[PDB]
């Protein structure tokens, strides 16, 4: 019994068990249930991280300390180590000798109680050929007799799926619900546990710091329950303060330190803005304008929304931004979104929405229901967001997607989280949701009847309203209608494409010089308001790339070439001069 089980009462005397703070209803229920018959044995079914082990182990510490009833004052508590019992069960009858011997000691004393943590495991523990014995069966007669009382703890899922299956054990055991405590109750627990953590790390936590940990952790960390989640910040905060300075100049834990620790655990960019990061944020609009010309309203909306999140003036349970980009073909809707990720140095979660045209395909985003071939792979959207909490979610061609797709996004915009088939929740608070749409684009290129063409921008918005539900538009932070590229804007676009060509030529050792007159000629030939910037690329391909390709493959530009481009005013045709150099 020395190795099979451990004496929790003795452990508390040496300080092994941590101090028990709170949970007075659970302790009261456990003690009263133990003394009475008719399911004397209490159970501690609760969710993970809710302190189930602390209630059973904290009871032994309380009994040795005092302030317990006389009947329970002398009741010693032991914990069953299932691994120890099976360590030496090589030969037949070893388990019987160990389990029966242990039960005899507990039963004969009549005041010893065994606390079997994770009691779901003992239901089995043996399937060897011939024996046909189990730990639960060995103790089933004793529990039915009621001579021996045993405490237990199990997860809610395990109790319903494992403990509930064995009606005999479930019938005897008395369930005691355990749930996450209140915010006030949790900070009190940390104060009670503050001497232990402070001693190990040689740090001191301020009253505000413990309060901040509970509020900040619950706000940003959702998967874990409140007791362990809040304590995880305290333990990590002490370690960081202890380990960060080699000189040990800073021993106390400031509130600012708690914020930084919570940020890394929850992978949120929200923190005090750094000088290096601050500079980049200021020039985000300027850099975006250099790459994407025009569409200033779109850039302003993205930059201002992102700035608010770092400043802290952001939606509590919604994404930083939910922008719908609708415009004519060829305008830089996708480019600004793609370039935004590069400028901000964050991953681009580009999800083409043409593939999700069918209703059944939407399950792919949130995962296939359990029990199918594709359940294991999981959702593509939730997994991507979990892997990259701070990222740009570019849902291009959202119009093509099935109406069911929009339903999923409605929850993300307001609730701020989406649950997959597995049940994990993805945090979209730091995700920049930009959905490009081509709705009402035919009207944009439609030429109205009459001498003077009419502005069909209003007609396009009506089509967008028809395709998108009113509730969907209300949730969106802003709807930006991209304007048609002007002649001045197109001139900048031509230069940008030439720069891309120059970079490609640099790889081959060729340098391209385009005169100002040549650039104007290219712009006029390819400038179409309806088609957009894309025709400019086609003009560059035929006029510039095609001649260079022949020379590059077979000609003067094969190695270390040079190029000059000028516009023949008399012939109104470009002249390409190649020097072998």
């Amino acid at each position: 019994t020395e190795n099979f089980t451990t004496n929790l009462n003795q452990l508390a005397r040496v300080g092994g068990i941590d101090p028990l703070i709170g949970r007075e209803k659970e302790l009261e229920r456990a003690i009263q249930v133990l003394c009475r018959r008719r399911k004397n044995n209490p159970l501690l079914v609760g969710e993970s991280g809710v302190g189930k082990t602390a209630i059973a182990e904290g009871l032994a510490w309380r009994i040795v300390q005092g302030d317990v009833p006389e009947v329970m004052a002398d009741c010693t508590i032991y914990s069953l180590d299932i691994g120890s019992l099976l360590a030496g069960t090589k030969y037949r009858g070893d388990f019987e000798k160990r389990f029966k011997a242990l039960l005899k000691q507990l039963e004969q004393d009549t005041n010893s109680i065994l606390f079997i943590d994770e009691i779901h495991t003992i239901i089995g523990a043996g399937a060897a050929s011939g024996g046909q014995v189990d730990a639960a069966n060995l103790i089933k007669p004793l529990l039915s007799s009621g001579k021996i009382r045993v405490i237990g703890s199990t997860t809610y899922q395990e109790f319903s799926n494992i403990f509930e299956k064995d009606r005999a054990l479930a019938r005897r055991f008395q369930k005691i619900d355990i749930t996450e405590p209140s915010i006030e109750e949790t900070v009190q627990i940390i104060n009670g546990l503050k001497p232990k953590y402070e001693a190990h790390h040689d740090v001191r936590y301020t009253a505000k710091a413990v309060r901040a940990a509970v509020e900040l952790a619950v706000k940003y960390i959702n998967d874990r329950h409140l007791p362990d989640k809040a304590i995880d910040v305290i333990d990590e905060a002490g370690a960081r303060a202890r380990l960060m300075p080699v000189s040990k100049r800073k021993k106390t834990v400031n509130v600012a330190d708690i914020e930084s620790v919570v940020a890394r655990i929850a992978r949120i960019p929200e923190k005090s803005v750094s000088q290096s990061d601050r500079d980049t944020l200021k020039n985000l609009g300027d850099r975006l304008k250099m790459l994407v010309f025009g569409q200033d309203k779109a850039i302003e909306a993205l930059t201002e929304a992102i700035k608010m999140a770092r400043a802290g003036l952001g939606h509590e349970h919604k994404p930083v931004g939910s922008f719908l980009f609708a415009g004519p073909t060829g305008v830089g809707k996708t480019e600004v979104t793609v370039q935004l990720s590069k400028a901000l140095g964050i991953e681009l979660l580009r999800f083409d929405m043409s593939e999700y045209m069918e209703r059944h395909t939407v399950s792919r985003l949130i995962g296939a229901p359990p029990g199918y071939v594709g359940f294991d792979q999981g959702g593509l959207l939730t997994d991507a967001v979990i892997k990259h909490p701070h990222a740009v979610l570019l849902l291009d061609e959202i119009e093509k997607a099935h109406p069911d797709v929009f339903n999923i996004l409605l929850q993300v915009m307001d609730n701020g989280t989406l649950t997959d088939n597995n049940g994990r929740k993805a945090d979209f608070r730091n995700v920049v949701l930009v959905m490009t749409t081509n709705a009402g684009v035919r009207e944009t290129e439609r030429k109205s009847i009459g001498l003077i063409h009419q502005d069909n921008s209003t007609d396009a918005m009506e089509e967008i309203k028809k395709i998108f539900t009113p509730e969907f538009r209300n949730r969106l932070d802003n709807i930006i209608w991209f304007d048609h590229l002007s002649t001045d804007v197109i001139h900048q676009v031509v230069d940008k494409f030439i720069v891309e060509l120059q970079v490609q030529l640099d790889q081959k050792g060729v340098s391209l010089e385009v005169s100002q007159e040549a650039r104007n000629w290219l712009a006029e030939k390819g400038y179409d308001r309806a088609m957009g910037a894309r025709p400019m690329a086609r003009v560059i391909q035929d006029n510039l790339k095609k001649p260079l390709a022949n020379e590059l493959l077979f000609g003067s530009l094969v190695d270390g070439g040079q190029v000059t481009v000028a516009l023949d005013k008399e012939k109104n045709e470009l002249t390409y001069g190649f020097q072998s150099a």
Partner: peptide
């Protein structure tokens, strides 16, 4: 009006007689 159609072995341990 299209319709979409949606679509034992364990190791054991031996104990020698004591």
């Amino acid at each position: 009006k299209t319709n979409d159609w949606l679509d034992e072995k364990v190791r054991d341990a031996l104990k020698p007689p004591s």
